[PDB]
Amino acid sequence: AHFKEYQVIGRRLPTESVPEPKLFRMRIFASNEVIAKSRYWYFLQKLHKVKKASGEIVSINQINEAHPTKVKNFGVWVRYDSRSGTHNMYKEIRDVSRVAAVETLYQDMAARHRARFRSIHILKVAEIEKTADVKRQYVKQFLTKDLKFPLPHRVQKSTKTFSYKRPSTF
Amino acid sequence: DHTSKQHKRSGHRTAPKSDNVYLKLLVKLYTFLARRTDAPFNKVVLKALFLSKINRPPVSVSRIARALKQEGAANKTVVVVGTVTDDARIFEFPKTTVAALRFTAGARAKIVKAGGECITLDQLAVRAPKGQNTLILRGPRNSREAVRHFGMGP
Amino acid sequence: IKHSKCRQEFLERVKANAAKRAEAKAQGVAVQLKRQPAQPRESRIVSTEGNVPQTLAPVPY
Amino acid sequence: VLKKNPLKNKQVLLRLNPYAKVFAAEKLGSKKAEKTGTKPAAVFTETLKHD
Amino acid sequence: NHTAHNQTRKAHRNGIKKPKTYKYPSLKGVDPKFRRNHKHALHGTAKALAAAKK
Amino acid sequence: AEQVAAERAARKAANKEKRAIILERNAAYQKEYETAERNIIQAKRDAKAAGSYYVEAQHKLVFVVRIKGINKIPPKPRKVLQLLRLTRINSGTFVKVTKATLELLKLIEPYVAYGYPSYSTIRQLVYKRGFGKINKQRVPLSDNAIIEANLGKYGILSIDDLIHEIITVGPHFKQANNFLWPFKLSNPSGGWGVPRKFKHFIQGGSFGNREEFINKLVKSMN
RNA sequence: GAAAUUGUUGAAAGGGAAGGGCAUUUGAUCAGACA
RNA sequence: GGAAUACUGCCAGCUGGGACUGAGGACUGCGACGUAAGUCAAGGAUGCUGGCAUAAUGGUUAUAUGCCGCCCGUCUUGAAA
RNA sequence: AAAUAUGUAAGAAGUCCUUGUUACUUAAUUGAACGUGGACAUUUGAAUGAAGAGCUUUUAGUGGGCCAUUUUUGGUAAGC
């Protein structure tokens, strides 16, 4: 769905002889509140020894975008499980907000590389502040000064099954 | 799903299998009293009217003599649903009131000779609507020829 | 050829049921001698003044 | 003979629950709470906006 | 030849019940030296409850 | 004879003292629920001001709704589904949450969908689809005197008193829940939302735990 | 003087079957009720 | 520094259009409005009007059209074979 | 040394006191077994459920099975 980036905070268990377990937080892209609590215990089990029964969730917080209307260049690091052994991947996305770029990444991996939702691990999404270090090319061609291009051959969506004009393009 | 089986049947009877005319009058009378007087006596008698020939074994008149040997029960009007049969093994019989369906002519003579009167079930309800001061006896059932419901170890 | 623990643990728990009931008969108060299962825990204010929660960022490979 | 639903047919809603009359008089569902402008701490925001 | 397919389901139609655990278990099988005294123990304790306690 | 109007005038007057208990007690409930939610909202705001993280207490009442139909069910869950009175497809009961009943739902989790209900759905299930078991037979409520004749031993003598022992889980939760017949619910009016139901709700399906989205799904089935 | 089976007359249908189920059109035919 | 609005949630908030059903048969019950008589949408539909009084509705039967329909009996783990 | 599976216990036929029996037992009226009398009540001893529970007769058909998921054995293999 439309993803929402969340902040999930976890605290193992206040037990006798160890008060105050340390704390842990993560940034989770997910569709709703119920997934991102369960997606939190997916990663955080792999990093150290807790479980869902041995742990508890402190608080979740929805992080809205700091600047929606400003247009950003985003670099994403991706670890995905292919049919062979898994491997890294770095891709660059020119999009509007943080959580909208991950929307167009899961489409991009599914289209080109056939990776589903369950195979991909979003490593880190960072904003490239200055230009001219944009490494990929397809992001870079939109960065020239005074960019102008037409849209040739536009189609027209007709509501009637018959039209009498013998229609023409643009 | 179904936790229990299905349409079950309560295996108990609701009407007697007999086609006797006079017995259905007593079923008609006690279905009146059991619905209204609400004493627990009438439900015990009404269940006892539907029973077969085998579940109504004959209560011998020496067995009524045992029931009057109980302490503080010398004047209770004994109620038998089945038949009261004679028994010439005892000799001295009390004076109480017996209420039953059928009296054998030997047991008919022994109660009237002793002094007590013998009464049918319609005159029981006329005397005792709630069934106060009554005492129900039932005959033995395993004295019947049921020595034969079998197993390897008897 | 054995002997059992769990029953002897029940025999000790009956003694606990006697003394609680005998005490609560003296000072008028509720007994609550039936056991209960585990319960969901209550609300507790947790202060992150001691330790700042550190981000994880599941990179490694 | 016939089960008339509450939450419509307000006569049978007032058959039950006689508090439902005075619920509409004080209006009690669209209620404005007294606002308290209490700003959150600075430690919470710097882990929320940033990482 | 042999199988146990559909045998657990036939047992759980009329259920699997207990031997309904009566009061006063049958002393047949107990050590007879205990049985021989325990006869004479009850024969005395019915006397003193009838003679004295009344 | 007598009793022409002499007893009716007093019997109608006796109910006027009866309705007065229900009117003022529901006022005590409506004051409690609004002070319950204000104190939780104030607790998060007072914790953000002090820089602390106010966790919530775990919810203590779930609402289980059967999803899959009646056949091809293994013997281990099918006994557990009968213990929660969930016989037919699209049925529901309220379940107190302990260590014991959390493990029962953990067995039948590919068959049911459950979450934490609000006050709104509990008020709308009892009024529209609530039925009562009176000595057998599933009698619909439609009246307070029906509950008062059957749960008068336990306190409860109005229909909102039955709700208050459901959401604010009291000492008499078991006896007040077992008075309720299992709920009979339709198919959802909007749809299930998703193409396939028999995947987990984390994976887009319908069964599993969803913790708040039971309140959107029941109002369609209500 | 029954049925299989057949003759004439009368109606109706019909491009490699026929017969049947639910639903109506058209055509033939018919009972009931209105004091 | 001050807002607005999305999004989620609540209302025992208001109001308009469409469809299916009228089961029950003197009275009793629980109620709401009214100062009271009472009235009322409160334990299930009534009021007003028009056409026709016969093949008009309807029943039957023949055919037409849309979709569906392998041949019965038995043996069999399995029958259109 | 898991997982899944599996045995029992979660109280009335119970606990506690006083002391009654006998030919068994003890060095011993010490035990053991069953008791009289007295104290202990609906939170009477975990959850949920119970569309009654319990027992008894009497007989019908059947005693050629097959398929799938998973674990397996013989077989290269298989609708073996």
CA dihedral F35, F38, F39, F43 (to 10 degrees): 180
Closest among B125, C37, C40, B17 to F100, alpha carbons compared: C37
CA separation for the pair F31, F33 (Å, rounded): 6
Q: Which nucleotide is nearest to C18 (CA to C1')?
A: I15
**Closest C-alpha among A51, A14, A30 to residue F53:** A14
**CA dist., res. F54 & res. F42, Å (int):** 10
Tokens of A53: 């029964």
**Given an 8 Å threshold on Cβ–Cβ distance, is D51 in contact with C48?**
no
Whole-number Å distance between alpha carbons of F82 and B1? 9
Neighbours of B23 (CB within 10 A): 15
Distances (CA, A) of B48 to A29, A40, B14, B99: 77, 72, 11, 14
CA-closest candidate to residue F86, choices F113, F106, F60, F59: F113
Distances, alpha carbon A48 to alpha carbons A43, A44, B68, C56, C58, in Å: 9, 7, 86, 11, 12
Rounded CA–C1' distance between E17 and I4, in angstroms: 25
CB contact under 8 A, C54 and A79: no
Length of chain B: 154
d(CA E16, CA E7): 13
Q: How many CB atoms lie within 10 A of CB F101?
A: 16
Residue C38: name the closest of F60, F117, A56 by CA: F60
Per the document, the length of chain F is 222
- Contact status of F209 with chain A (Cβ, < 8 Å): yes
User: What are F103's two structure tokens?
Assistant: 């493990």
Neighbouring C-beta atoms of residue F151, cutoff 10 Å:
20
Ramachandran class of D30: left when φ > 0, alpha when ψ lies in -120 to 50, beta otherwise: beta
Residue ranges of the domains in chain A? Answer: 2-68, 69-145
Strand partners, B98: B78, B118
Chain D contact set for C49 (CB, 8 A): 43
Query: CB of C37 within 8 Å of any CB in chain F?
Result: yes
F83 nearest nt, CA–C1' = I49
Burial of F119 (0-12, 13-18, 19+ CB in 10 A): middle
If you count DSSP H runs as helices and E runs as strands, how many of each does chain E have, helices first? 2, 0
Q: Which of F126, B117, A154 is nearest to D5 (CA)?
A: F126
Q: Find the CB nearest D7 among F51, F127, F159.
A: F127
List of chain F residues whose C-beta atoms are within 8 Å of the C-beta of residue C47? 50-53
Q: How is residue E8 written in tokens?
A: 């657990």
What SS3 class is residue A112? helix
Distance between CA atoms of residues A92 and A90, nearest Å: 7
Instruction: Kindly state whether F136 is in contact with chain C, defined as any CB-CB distance less than 8 angstroms.
Output: no
User: Helices marked H in F56-155 — which ranges?
Assistant: 75-83, 99-107, 119-129, 145-148
Which residues on neighbouring strands pair with residue A80, listed in sequence order?
A87, A120
* Buried b or exposed e, range F25-46, using 16+ CB within 10 angstroms: bbeebbeeeeeeeeeeeebbee
Contacts for E27 with CB less than 8 Å, ≥ 6 apart:
E35, E38
Separation CA E37–CA F116 (nearest Å): 67
Q: Degrees (nearest 5) of the Cα angle F182, F186, F192?
A: 115
The candidate with the shortest Cα–Cα distance to F109, out of F120, F95, F127, is: F95
Angle between helices B21-36 and B40-49 (to 10 degrees): 160
How many other CB atoms are there within 10 angstroms of residue A160's CB atom?
6
Q: How far apart are CA A80 and CA A88, in angstroms?
A: 7
- Measured N-to-C along each axis, helices F8-49 and F159-167 cross at an angle, to the nearest 10 degrees, of 30
Check whether residue B8 has its CB closer than 7 Å to nucleic acid strand I. Answer: yes
Domain ranges of chain B: 12-143
* Helical (H) or strand (E) element with A57: strand A57-62
Q: Are chains A and B touching, using the cut-off of 8 Å on CB pairs and a minimum of 3 such pairs?
A: no
User: Measuring CA to CA, which residue among F24, F222, F37, F55 is closest to residue F126?
Assistant: F222
Compute the distance between CA of residue D47 and CA of residue D49 in angstroms, rounded to an integer: 6
How would you write A109-152 as a 3-class SS string?
HHHHCCCCCCCEEEEEEEECCCCCCCCCCCCHHHCCCCCCCCCC
Mutate to test the interface with C, among F45, F48, F53, F96 (most CBs of C within 10 A): F53
Let me know: does F156 contact F147? Beta carbons within 8 Å. yes
Interface present between D and B (3 or more CB pairs within 8 Å): no
Which token pair is A108?
């991009």
PDB experimental method? cryo-EM
- Touching, C vs E (3+ Cβ pairs under 8 A): no
- CA distances, C45 to each of A128, B72, C41, C49 (Å): 39, 75, 13, 12
The residue that minimises its CA distance to C1' of I16 is: C18
The CA distance from B39 to B44, in Å, is 10
* Cα–Cα dist B50/C27, whole Å: 59
Contact by Cβ (8 Å): F193, F98: no
d(CA E14, CA F115): 37
F1 Cα distance to chain centroid:
49
d(CA B25, CA A21): 85
**Burial class for F130, CB neighbours closer than 10 Å (0-12, 13-18, 19+):** buried
DSSP string, C1-61: ----SHHHHHHHHHHHHHHHHHHHHHTT-----S----------EEETTS-PPEE------
Helices (H), ranges, chain A: 33-47, 98-112
Residue F143 neighbours by CB under 8 Å, 6+ apart: D15, D16
Are F88 and B1 within 8 A, CB to CB? yes
B partners (3+ CB pairs within 8 A) are F
Indicate the residue type of C26: A
The answer regarding whether domain B12-143 maps to CATH 3.30.1540.20 reads no
Question: Which 1-51 positions of D have CB less than 7 A from strand H?
Answer: 1-2, 4, 7, 9-15, 17-21, 23-24, 27, 29-30, 37
CA dihedral A143, A148, A149, A151 (to 10 degrees): 120
Residue F132 contacts residue F140 (beta carbons within 8 Å): yes
Q: Do D6 and F127 touch (CB under 8 A)?
A: yes
Residue F94: helix, strand or coil by DSSP? strand
Closest B-chain CA to F85: B3
Query: How far, in Å, CA of F174 to CA of F91, rounded?
Result: 19
Q: Are A101 and A74 in contact (CB under 8 A)?
A: yes
CB A113 within 8 A of CB A88: no
C-beta separation of A13 from A56 below 8 A: yes
Please state whether strand H lies within 7 Å of residue F210 at its CB atom. no
- CB contacts of A7 in chain D (<8 Å) are 47-48
| Nucleotide of closest approach to F133 (CA, C1') | I51
Angle between helices F75-83 and F99-107 (to 10 degrees): 130
**Degrees, nearest 5: CA angle E16-E18-E19:** 130
CA dist A145 and A128 (Å) reads 18
Cβ–Cβ gap C40/F97 under 8 Å: yes
Q: Is there a contact between B32 and B126 (Cβ–Cβ < 8 Å)? A: no
Residue type, F2: E
* Data resolution in angstroms: 3.6
Whole-angstrom distance, CA of residue F174 vs CA of residue F165: 10
Backbone Cα Rg of chain D: 22
Is any atom of nucleic acid chain I found less than 7 Å from the CB of residue E11?
Answer: no
Pairing of strands F91-96, F61-66: antiparallel
For residue A25, the chain D residues in CB contact (below 8 A) are 47
Separation of alpha carbons F220 and B84, rounded Å: 71
- 8 Å CB contact between A94 and A139: yes
Q: Which residues share a beta bridge with B134?
A: B77
Would you tell me how many other CB atoms lie within 10 Å of the CB of residue A133? 10
Residue F12: CB less than 7 A from any atom in strand H = yes
Residue C55, chain D, CB below 8 Å: the answer is: yes
The CATH number given to A69-145 is: 3.10.20.10
What's at B131, amino acid-wise? Answer: G
CB proximity list for F138: less than 8 A, separation 6 or greater: F131, F132, F181
Residue F31's nearest CA partner among D19, D10, D12, D17 is: D19
d(CA B31, CA B38): 11
Q: Are A122 and A39 in contact (CB under 8 A)?
A: no
Task: Find the nucleotide nearest D24 (Cα to C1′).
Answer: H12
Residue from the list C38, C43, C48 with its beta carbon closest to the beta carbon of F51: C48
Containing F9, the helix (H) or strand (E) segment is helix F8-49
Per the DSSP assignment, residues forming a β-bridge with C54 are A24
Q: Is A61 on the interface with D (CB under 8 A)?
A: yes
End-to-end CA distance of chain C: 57
| Encoded tokens for A89 | 């991947």
Cβ–Cβ of C48/D43 closer than 8 Å? yes
For strand I, give the nucleotides within 7 A of a protein CB.
Answer: 5, 7-11, 13-16, 20-24, 32-36, 40-41, 43-58, 65-67
CA distance F184 to F221: 9
Cβ of residue C9 closer than 8 Å to a chain F Cβ: no
Spatial distance between the Cα atoms of A124 and A128, rounded to a whole number of angstroms: 12
The fold of the A2-68 domain, in CATH, is Ubiquitin-like (UB roll) (3.10.20)
Closest CB from A9, A35, A58 relative to F202 = A35
CB contact under 8 A, B3 and F88: no
C1’ H71 / CA E6, Å: 36
Backbone angles phi, psi at D42, to 5 degrees: -85, -20
**Could you tell me if F49 and F202 are in contact, meaning their C-beta atoms sit under 8 angstroms apart?**
no
Strands F183-184 and F91-96: antiparallel
DSSP notation for B68-133: TTSTT-TT-EEEESSEEE--SS--------EE-SEE-HHHHHHHHHHT--EE-HHHHHHH-SS-TT
Instruction: Say if the Cβ atoms of C44 and F60 lie within 8 Å.
Output: no
First to last CA, chain D: 65
Q: Which of B55, B67, B111 is nearest to B85 (CA)?
A: B111
Is D28 within 8 Å of F37 (Cβ atoms)?
A: no
F149 touches strand H (CB under 7 A): no
Q: What is the number of H-type helices and E-type strands within chain A?
A: 2, 6
